Design a protein around this ligand. Structure first.
Ligand code: QQ4
Ligand code: U9U
Ligand code: MN
Ligand code: MN
Length: 180
């Protein structure tokens, strides 16, 4: 109670994104007032997912992140029973109707190579596409098929660096980076 991180989070991100992040953390037994770096992280991942689905065509993506566990798994079951895609063991973030595959979006404060290595080991199922962004401006996608336009990806990286600058100007960036 009283953290600068919580107030900055609720100020820097959009009210719907803050509400969704709060519902998610509470759904997973996590306190946004005590685990405030993770509050920021959930909000950032949520905004990156929304931006990512805003790129590309109109009907292209199905958003999985942001829903509650049960409804997200229901939509996943529908996607699988519709397209015949292998049911992912763990919840992805998006589904691409154009490339016909699930998408796992990563946002890390560490080296992108490491984070993708970790997430690729965790998923193991070599069917789901994996796309990592970084707060330094780096990105890395499975097969190096980055799915979206260059402009749409550049927008996301710019937003990430803006978040990083806003945290640094308030002296919460060191803690955020070392928290991962
Ligand atoms: C569809 C609805 C909410 C969506 C959330 C998502 C967020 C969207 C905000 C809107 C405004 N836009 C769209 C244009 C720009 C903008 O600002 N964007 C996109 C950019 C950043 C951002 O914030 N979108 C996309 C469609 C409209 C909408 O709101 N979500 C939340 C998780 C699942 C989902 O589909 N739903 C569906 C049922 C529950 C619910 O809440
Ligand atoms: O989907 C995700 N979580 C789904 C479950 C969940 C959602 C929101 N709140 C709590 C639970 C997800 N989580 C992360 C960060 C992370 C990584 C490993 C374990 C736990 C977490 C965290 F912080 F979320 F608990 N990075 C991603 O890229 C990503 O997709
Ligand atoms: Mn997710
Ligand atoms: Mn993700």
């Amino acid at each position: 109670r009283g953290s600068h991180m919580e107030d900055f989070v609720r100020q820097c991100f959009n009210p719907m994104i803050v509400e969704l992040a709060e519902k998610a953390m509470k759904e997973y037994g996590e306190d946004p007032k005590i685990e405030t770096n993770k509050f920021a992280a959930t909000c950032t991942h949520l905004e990156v997912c929304f931006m990512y689905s805003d790129g590309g065509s109109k009907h292209r993506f199905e958003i999985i992140e942001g829903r509650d566990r049960i409804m997200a798994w229901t939509v996943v079951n529908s996607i699988c029973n519709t397209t015949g895609v292998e049911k992912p063991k763990f919840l992805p973030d998006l589904y691409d109707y154009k490339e016909n595959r699930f998408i796992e979006i990563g946002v890390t404060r560490r080296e992108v190579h490491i984070y993708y290595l970790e997430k690729a080991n965790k998923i193991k199922s070599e069917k789901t596409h994996i796309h990592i962004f970084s707060f330094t401006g780096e990105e890395m996608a499975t097969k190096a098929d980055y799915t979206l336009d260059e402009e749409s990806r550049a927008r996301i990286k710019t937003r990430l660096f803006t978040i990083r600058q806003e945290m640094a100007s308030r002296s919460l960036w060191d803690s955020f980076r070392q928290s991962e």
